[model samples]
Target: MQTQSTCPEIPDKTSICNSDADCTPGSVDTHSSGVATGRCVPFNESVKTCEVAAWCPV
Candidate 1:
């Protein structure tokens, strides 16, 4: 769980977003995991995930 990079997010049922407006790249205290990057990038060909500023390994 590093905090100095951008990477795909861990699959979270409550943390998925489809639009950029849904992301909030901010404090980790409020969030349960990685900081958002205002990017709702693809997690894979089948789904999407918020590209985070990081905690979980990429």
Candidate 2:
């Protein structure tokens, strides 16, 4: 027999942080872009977001 698991929808208010420890990779119930490496980086000159291995640029 096979079992099916359901992943909850991503939260409307996601976790926000200034650095890596604030994020927990594979820690949430939904599908995140990637795991956080615990680095707070600039998405651009005007804004900053958590750096995750899942969607961060190389």
Candidate 3:
């Protein structure tokens, strides 16, 4: 899903998030990745991994 960027700014993974709402739309669950660090990024065609982002759809 290539929608307009609705991703919200999120706290650094070092910080705590109460729920998914605390994260930007495209934000991935920190637990899912090997790195605890979560990043807030927009989807771009140049990047092949946006599909893995939280807001992107397959």
Candidate 4:
């Protein structure tokens, strides 16, 4: 028999942080996705948000 691996479902949480470190991985939240990539990407020209492996390119 063969086995397959799968990833967990991403949450819909929004963490307010100034840097990637702020958004710790495995943190329990009602509306949060997968673990944080420890990257603070720009959501716009004047706003930046944490980049999660679950839902990036936002």
| Predicted structure 2: lDDT | 0.44
For residue 57, what is the lDDT in candidate 2? 22
Which stretches in model 4 have alpha-carbon errors above 4 Å?
A: 1-15, 20-30, 55-58
Model 3 lDDT per residue over 1-58, tens place: 3543323233343534433334333335565332222333343333212122234224
- Give the per-residue lDDT of model 2 (tens digit) for 1-58: 4433322222233443454556444433245644544546555455555544433222
Pairs of residues at least 3 apart in sequence or in different chains that clash in candidate 3? 26-54, 26-55
What is model 3's C-alpha RMSD?
A: 12.2
Specify the poorest-scoring 10-residue window by lDDT in model 4.
3-12
Q: List candidate 2 stretches off by more than 4 Å.
A: 1-17, 20-29, 55-58
Rank order (by TM-score, best first) = 1, 4, 2, 3
> Which residue pairs in candidate 2 have backbone atoms (N, alpha carbon, C) closer than 3 angstroms, thus clashing?
20-38, 34-54
Error of 2 at 34 (Å): 1.7
Give residue 57's lDDT in candidate 1 (0 to 100).
49
Give the per-residue lDDT digits (tens) of candidate 4, residues 1-58: 4332222333223534455556554533345535545555565555566555454231
Look at candidate 4 and tell me the lDDT of residue 49.
Answer: 61
- What TM-score does candidate 4 reach? 0.43
Query: For model 3, where is the 10-residue window of minimal lDDT?
Result: 45-54
Clash count for each candidate, listed in order shown: 1, 2, 2, 5
CA deviation > 4 Å runs, candidate 3: 1-21, 24-31, 45-58
